[PDB]
């Protein structure tokens, strides 16, 4: 990694939905749903060829 930054759900400046998603993304993360959804879509044909 050259740097490190992350994916933010954008809101306009002053949205009350900012904190309601900030708490919500932490709620999917502490439960484990953000790891379920990543390992369902970033899964696939794992490269056999190397072995």
């Amino acid at each position: 990694l050259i740097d490190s930054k992350g994916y933010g759900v954008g809101t306009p400046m002053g949205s009350p939905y900012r904190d309601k998603i900030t708490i919500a993304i932490l709620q999917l993360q502490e439960e484990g749903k953000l790891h379920m959804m990543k390992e369902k879509w970033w899964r696939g044909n794992g490269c056999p060829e190397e072995e």
Binding site: L1, G6, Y7, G8, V9, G10, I25, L34, W41
Partner: protein
């Protein structure tokens, strides 16, 4: 309708509406960009100006948190950890190593 979409970012968006409560309507940006400040007019590009000019409410998308974007829009906290890295072809050749005994 809003049924033809799938992926990580659309499976996530139904999870946010389940906890918070709303019925989202997905609308693609027609500019096809994400956002960049031009050096000639001081204006913007796709997902960023859709939130600046209030033609949107959220931007649930691969929209990375940079310094110059959060000075105009407000992000949430990250839902995925990336970093810039280099893609290149896997080397398909073998080293000679002609002795090897």
């Amino acid at each position: 309708g809003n049924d033809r979409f799938e992926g990580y970012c659309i499976d996530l968006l139904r999870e946010l509406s389940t906890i918070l409560g709303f019925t989202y309507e997905i609308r693609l940006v027609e500019d096809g960009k994400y956002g960049a400040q031009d050096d000639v007019n001081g204006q913007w590009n796709g997902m960023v100006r859709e939130l600046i000019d209030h033609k949107a409410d959220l931007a649930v998308a691969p929209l990375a948190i940079t310094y110059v974007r959060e000075k105009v829009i407000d992000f949430s906290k990250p839902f995925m950890t990336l970093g810039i890295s280099i893609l290149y072809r896997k080397p398909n050749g073998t080293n000679p190593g002609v002795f090897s005994f």
